[PDB]
């Protein structure tokens, strides 16, 4: 594993952050009582009656750490420029991804621990197939933070015309525009317009 495999694992864990916070808001069972008789039941009973909340909380922390690792990519050298030849926008992913792989988990009942073990195994299976299927750039947590995904064909000033690269830009992109590349992998790079 490792290297590219760890990068795709980090992208998938960052993608599932909306699922983690959705399970957090759906099933928490926090005693939100506005009366004086609802005292503290104890820390041990609270952490016993809540298992998948704290599991999803440390998974959300893992997703935040992997988003920090993705934001570390643009910190170093990205001071080179290319020219976009084709700018066919592919941003219906991370909406198709959400409405296909997250809405069923909202349509799923979280009552028994056997069922939760089965759903975690389903998450692991979906991630394992999602590792190596070249649709790994779909990321609703990325699309919430202003990022719009594009399928671009850059043209280097001195190397050549490399084709079929995926750009994650902060703003809109267009044919005959200059962006700054910071390659997270061979296929996906974080873009930034030059103006």
């Amino acid at each position: 594993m490792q290297r590219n495999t760890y990068n795709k694992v980090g992208l998938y864990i960052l993608s599932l952050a909306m699922l983690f916070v959705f399970i957090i808001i759906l099933t928490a069972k926090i005693p939100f009582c506005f009366t004086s008789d609802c005292s503290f039941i104890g820390l041990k009973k609270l952490v016993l009656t809540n298992i998948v909340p704290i599991v999803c909380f440390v998974f959300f922390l893992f997703s935040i750490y992997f988003y920090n690792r993705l934001k570390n990519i643009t910190k170093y050298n990205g001071q080179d420029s290319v020219k976009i030849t084709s700018c066919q926008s592919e941003s219906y992913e991370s909406l198709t991804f959400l409405a296909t792989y997250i809405v069923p988990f909202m349509g799923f009942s979280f009552e028994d621990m056997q069922k939760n073990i089965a759903y975690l195994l389903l998450v692991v299976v979906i991630g394992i197939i999602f590792i190596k299927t070249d649709k790994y750039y779909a990321n609703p947590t990325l699309a919430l933070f202003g990022f719009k995904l594009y399928r671009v064909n850059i043209l280097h000033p001195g190397s050549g015309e490399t084709k079929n690269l995926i750009a994650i830009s902060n703003d809109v992109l267009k044919v005959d525009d200059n962006v700054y590349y910071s390659f997270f992998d061979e296929f996906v790079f974080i873009a930034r317009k030059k103006i």
């Binding site: 910190k75 050298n77 420029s81 290319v82 280097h156 001195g158 050549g160 490399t162 200059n178």
Partner: protein, 315 residues
Amino acid sequence: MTTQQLKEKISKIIDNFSGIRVVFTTTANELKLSRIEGSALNSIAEGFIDKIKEDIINNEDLTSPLLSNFDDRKNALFKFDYEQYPEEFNKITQAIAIPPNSQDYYNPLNKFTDVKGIIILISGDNKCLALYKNKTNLAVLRNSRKMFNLVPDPDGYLKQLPNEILRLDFNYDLFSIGEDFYIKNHKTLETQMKFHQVIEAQAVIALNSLRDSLLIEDISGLEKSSREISFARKLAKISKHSPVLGKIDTKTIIDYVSQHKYLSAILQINEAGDKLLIKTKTSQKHFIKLMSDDYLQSDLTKIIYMSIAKDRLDE
């Protein structure tokens, strides 16, 4: 390519500035790319742009002669014109066209002991400029003498950082434009790029031509001096661009030495009146400069002059 067209191409790269990229070459002959911080890379790009502007753009006294006509002038970028390219030049040409989605990134756990040179790829207006650098002995430097784990110390014994720091000062040894290579520093090219054997082979050809010219009485003095690289530069210049050796008869040369104010008292004619006695190092240097056509007089002031840096005017 003249100097004005070179200035125009450098200007056309500079004002339509696109961006830079730093590529390391290694001792095992492969190309890796580095992880430089954004503000540090911006400062490097601005410093290299300022140095390149002071060298070509704002410089009025710029000349670009061929490396086979290498004199000892300053503020010049010598043009490569030899047939055989060294392997670092081909590695520069390969480093121009590395695709931007490459993943052969440099590993900084090697403590920077494997990097042989630093290639700066200044790009702009669909053209690539490839500066070159050499890593010296860490560019010897200092520290602050942390007293235990705290930085300020008025009693600070000034010490050196260990073998982990790379020099990236604002200077370049040679740069690449288009398909031509221009050279600024000659010592790193004669040392690191394995070029002094080519210079020595050209010196061997020049010594063979001097022996066949049937002029020097004692060949073995010139052969004795020929192992020096600074002398071998002059035999390379003699082999490729001498306008007196072989063009004219030797009798005119010996008449010129017999009819001069300075050469008659330095270079001595033999007893038979056909050879030149060249024994001392001073006589060797004066004969080399005589065969290099460095003894010129003015038709205005009638003053004989030595010329360290010459230029043929009909060019």
